[PDB]
From Swiss-Prot:
Residues of the full protein shown: 497 to 662 of 837
Positions that bind acetyl-CoA: C84, A85, V86, Q91, V92, K93, G94, Y95, G96, T97, Y122
Residues annotated for succinyl-CoA binding in this entry: C84, A85, V86, Q91, V92, K93, G94, Y95, G96, T97, Y122
Expression sites (tissue/organ): Expressed in all tissues tested.
Segments forming domain N-acetyltransferase: 8-161
Origin organism lineage: Eukaryota, Metazoa, Chordata, Craniata, Vertebrata
Recorded domain comment: Loop3 is required for substrate specificity and adopts different structural conformations in succinyl-CoA-bound and acetyl-CoA-bound forms. Tyr-150 has an important role in the selective binding of succinyl-CoA over acetyl-CoA.
Subunit structure and binding partners: Homooligomer; may form a tetramer of homodimers. Interacts with EP300, CREBBP and ADA2. Component of the TFTC-HAT complex, at least composed of TAF5L, TAF6L, TAF3, TADA3L, SUPT3H/SPT3, TAF2/TAFII150, TAF4/TAFII135, TAF5/TAFII100, KAT2A/GCN5L2, TAF10 and TRRAP. Component of the STAGA transcription coactivator-HAT complex, at least composed of SUPT3H, KAT2A, SUPT7L, TAF5L, TAF6L, TADA3L, TAD1L, TAF10, TAF12, TRRAP and TAF9. The STAGA core complex is associated with a subcomplex required for histone deubiquitination composed of ATXN7L3, ENY2 and USP22.
Domain of life: Eukaryota
Species name: Homo sapiens (Human)
Intracellular or extracellular location(s): Nucleus; Chromosome; Cytoplasm, Cytoskeleton, Microtubule organizing center, Centrosome
Modified residues (N6-acetyllysine): K54
Name under which the protein is recorded: Histone acetyltransferase KAT2A
Record note on modification: Acetylated at Lys-54, inhibiting the protein acetyltransferase activity.
Amino acid sequence: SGIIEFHVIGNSLTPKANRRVLLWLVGLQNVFSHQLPRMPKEYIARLVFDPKHKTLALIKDGRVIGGICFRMFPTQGFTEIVFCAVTSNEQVKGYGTHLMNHLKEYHIKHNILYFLTYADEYAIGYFKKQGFSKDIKVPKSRYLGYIKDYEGATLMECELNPRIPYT
Ligand SMILES: CCCC(=O)SCCNC(=O)CCNC(=O)[C@H](O)C(C)(C)COP(=O)(O)OP(=O)(O)OC[C@H]1O[C@@H](n2cnc3c(N)ncnc32)[C@H](O)[C@@H]1OP(=O)(O)O
């Protein structure tokens, strides 16, 4: 096609059955590893290939140029943002925002209207631009022991509005 494409992919059972998806998952694992260099690569690989986790992939000419790895908790009423990266050469063009907006549209469709994520300090502003806040409204009992945590990171929340804003 020669245009960007959004694919929501993952490992449903085993990743070997669809080699195109497998190659994209490896690409995602490598993008996440390169852009989240303090994350252990084995941790990234495990979660990207975990069947409870999906990744919204941004593909350009067969190559993964970014993605958001997430876990949906429909009963909890929230989705956990696990990894969020754009490949370095493709950064600062609007893709990181483009990815998050898409992810929001997907979730509105699935009637999940809250994102929770941990953020390292130097990424907080990206999440703030995407409407995330450090003020958590999801009760602690809804996410404690559901979401993964990290030493020193800041928990942030985005409240989605399904209502289309028109001025
Ligand atoms: C483990 C917990 C979950 C996580 O992944 S936390 C770590 C999140 N990801 C990373 O740190 C990976 C490394 N960085 C990246 O991959 C990219 O910088 C990132 C965050 C995906 C953004 O991708 P881009 O394609 O550059 O996004 P974009 O072109 O839509 O521009 C982003 C808009 O937000 C703004 N922003 C504010 N504080 C920022 C900050 N600290 N880092 C990045 N952007 C920031 C930025 O100025 C831009 O807005 P505007 O275009 O100026 O209006």
